[PDB]
């Protein structure tokens, strides 16, 4: 399976007895403390500050498992910031979750890149995802206690950011939030490259959620790029839609299409589905990958377990293991859903702390199913991915960083010592700069300069 993609994380932020600390401030000093607030990792990765909160984002990857490893080590690299955070010389320490929302009316974003034909008609394009985006909350949430946006209302549901989300397709801002951002900022080549900017989804600590929203998202643009889809899975009043699937845990609620047909949203998810399969059987027949395979199968078999039992997907799913803790808490001590107890358990699942966190607990515990090892994990942390121009540039991070004046997705900008201009090298194809292409030519410089020069 092969699309360029990446996800971009705001991570929770809070300062314990320190109602004087500022968010911005805070954030700023979680970047700075990994540092050694903009800045480029080896990794190909970026962190940096973005609407008050810190923020990880994966280098470009071509795959969901690729994409859940170096999302993972942006997990530990947040981790580790806060914890260097700590030891600076103002000693505020920083605790940083990963999830959507404070339950005091804040709401943050979890953004998914991914890169499309510019061919591709942006009408289908809306048409064939806010269906799926409206419906892939079901495997997709990672869940939340309260509901509206304030969380005063009583009970849990399935997605942390639907709440927050007013309108179908349009602009991100502060005002509103648009199931479809219009933005295009493709960082590549504008005529060859569309890049669409998803910002509905839940931040996901499973790895096997990560990959069924990253994968299946993958698999319904390749539908909808050789206008596969004949079907109108069109809904009335989406966001209405959205919202009322999120808060109806019992995953029983239908929602009205548009040709006059009733289903749930897990229904929908199997029209998707069946449709995918029916694509990647007629495109690629017998030569199919192995990965398109695996995620249509955890697809389907996710599905079939939601609809026979939710719980059992407890190992798998986020909102279902949370939700599992949660109904521990309410059997123990007889809580209802507005006991303040219940949202702290729902923000500590995402506490990215290896002791305190509630998801890597349940890790710790073997009660929680994963895709990738701990050792590639820590290896995504200060290694780039083979298969795309991240390579190039963290690569060059790590060798050439003394002599790099800036860095960015599109390009690479040295200081060549004895030369008046900072010498600007474009990455515009984010399928060039890979290993084959760059790996061998970045073995042999022994300088910037060499490499500048190899290059031009």
């Given at each position: 399976?092969?699309?360029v993609?990446?996800?971009?994380?705001?991570?929770?932020?809070?300062?314990?007895?320190?109602?004087?600390?500022?968010?911005?401030?805070?954030?700023?000093?979680?970047?700075?403390?990994?540092?050694?607030?903009?800045?480029?990792?080896?990794?190909?990765?970026?962190?940096?500050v973005?609407?008050?909160?810190?923020?990880?984002?994966?280098?470009?990857?071509?795959?969901?498992?690729?994409?859940?490893?170096?999302?993972?080590?942006?997990?530990?690299?947040?981790?580790?910031?806060?914890?260097?955070?700590?030891?600076?010389?103002?000693?505020?320490?920083?605790?940083?979750?990963?999830?959507?929302?404070?339950?005091?009316?804040?709401?943050?974003?979890?953004?998914?890149?991914?890169?499309?034909?510019?061919?591709?008609?942006?009408?289908?394009?809306?048409?064939?995802?806010?269906?799926?985006?409206?419906?892939?909350?079901?495997?997709?949430?990672?869940?939340?206690?309260?509901?509206?946006?304030?969380?005063?209302?009583?009970?849990?549901?399935?997605s942390?950011?639907?709440?927050?989300?007013?309108?179908?397709?349009?602009?991100?801002?502060?005002?509103?939030?648009?199931?479809?951002?219009?933005?295009?900022?493709?960082?590549?080549?504008?005529?060859?490259?569309?890049?669409?900017?998803?910002?509905?989804?839940?931040?996901?600590?499973?790895?096997?959620?990560?990959y069924?929203?990253?994968?299946?998202?993958?698999?319904?643009?390749?539908?909808?790029?050789?206008?596969?889809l004949?079907?109108?899975?069109?809904?009335?009043?989406?966001?209405?839609?959205?919202?009322?699937?999120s808060?109806?845990?019992?995953l029983?609620?239908?929602?009205?299409?548009?040709?006059?047909?009733?289903?749930?949203?897990?229904?929908?998810?199997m029209?998707?589905?069946?449709?995918?399969?029916?694509?990647?059987?007629?495109?690629?027949?017998?030569?199919?990958?192995?990965?398109?395979?695996?995620?249509?199968?955890?697809?389907?078999?996710?599905?079939?377990?939601?609809?026979?039992?939710?719980?059992?997907?407890?190992?798998?799913?986020?909102?279902?293991?949370?939700?599992?803790?949660?109904?521990?808490?309410?059997?123990?001590?007889?809580?209802?859903?507005?006991?303040?107890?219940?949202?702290?358990?729902?923000?500590?699942?995402?506490?990215?702390?290896?002791?305190?966190?509630?998801?890597?607990?349940?890790?710790?515990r073997?009660?929680?199913?994963?895709?990738?090892?701990?050792?590639?994990?820590?290896?995504?942390?200060?290694?780039?991915?083979?298969?795309?121009?991240?390579?190039?540039?963290?690569?060059?991070?790590?060798?050439?960083?003394?002599?790099?004046?800036?860095?960015?997705?599109?390009?690479?900008?040295?200081?060549?010592?004895?030369?008046?201009?900072?010498?600007?090298?474009?990455?515009?194809?984010?399928?060039?700069?890979?290993?084959?292409?760059?790996?061998?030519?970045?073995?042999?410089?022994?300088?910037?300069?060499?490499?500048?020069?190899?290059?031009?």
């Amino acid at each position: 399976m092969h699309r360029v993609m990446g996800i971009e994380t705001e991570y929770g932020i809070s300062v314990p007895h320190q109602p004087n600390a500022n968010a911005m401030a805070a954030s700023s000093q979680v970047v700075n403390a990994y540092a050694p607030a903009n800045v480029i990792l080896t990794n190909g990765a970026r962190l940096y500050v973005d609407h008050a909160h810190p923020e990880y984002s994966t280098p470009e990857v071509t795959n969901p498992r690729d994409a859940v490893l170096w999302d993972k080590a942006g997990e530990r690299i947040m981790a580790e910031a806060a914890r260097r955070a700590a030891d600076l010389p103002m000693g505020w320490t920083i605790q940083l979750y990963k999830n959507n929302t404070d339950n005091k009316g804040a709401s943050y974003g979890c953004h998914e890149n991914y890169l499309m034909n510019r061919s591709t008609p942006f009408a289908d394009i809306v048409r064939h995802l806010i269906p799926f985006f409206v419906t892939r909350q079901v495997f997709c949430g990672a869940g939340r206690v309260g509901i509206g946006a304030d969380g005063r209302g009583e009970g849990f549901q399935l997605s942390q950011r639907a709440d927050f989300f007013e309108v179908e397709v349009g602009l991100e801002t502060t005002l509103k939030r648009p199931i479809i951002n219009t933005r295009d900022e493709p960082h590549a080549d504008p005529e060859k490259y569309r890049r669409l900017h998803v910002i509905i989804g839940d931040a996901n600590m499973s790895e096997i959620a990560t990959y069924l929203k990253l994968g299946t998202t993958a698999l319904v643009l390749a539908m909808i790029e050789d206008g596969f889809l004949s079907q109108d899975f069109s809904v009335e009043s989406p966001v209405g839609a959205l919202r009322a699937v999120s808060h109806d845990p019992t995953l029983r609620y239908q929602l009205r299409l548009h040709d006059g047909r009733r289903l749930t949203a897990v229904q929908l998810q199997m029209e998707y589905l069946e449709q995918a399969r029916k694509y990647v059987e007629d495109r690629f027949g017998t030569d199919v990958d192995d990965m398109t395979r695996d995620v249509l199968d955890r697809w389907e078999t996710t599905l079939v377990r939601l609809a026979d039992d939710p719980m059992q997907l407890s190992r798998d799913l986020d909102w279902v293991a949370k939700l599992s803790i949660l109904e521990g808490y309410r059997q123990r001590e007889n809580l209802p859903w507005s006991a303040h107890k219940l949202q702290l358990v729902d923000l500590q699942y995402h506490d990215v702390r290896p002791d305190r966190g509630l998801y890597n607990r349940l890790v710790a515990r073997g009660r929680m199913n994963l895709l990738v090892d701990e050792a590639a994990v820590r290896t995504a942390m200060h290694e780039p991915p083979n298969d795309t121009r991240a390579y190039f540039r963290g690569r060059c991070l790590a060798k050439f960083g003394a002599e790099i004046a800036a860095a960015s997705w599109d390009s690479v900008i040295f200081d060549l010592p004895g030369r008046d201009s900072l010498q600007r090298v474009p990455t515009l194809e984010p399928l060039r700069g890979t290993r084959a292409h760059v790996g061998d030519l970045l073995d042999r410089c022994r300088s910037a300069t060499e490499l500048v020069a190899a290059l031009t």
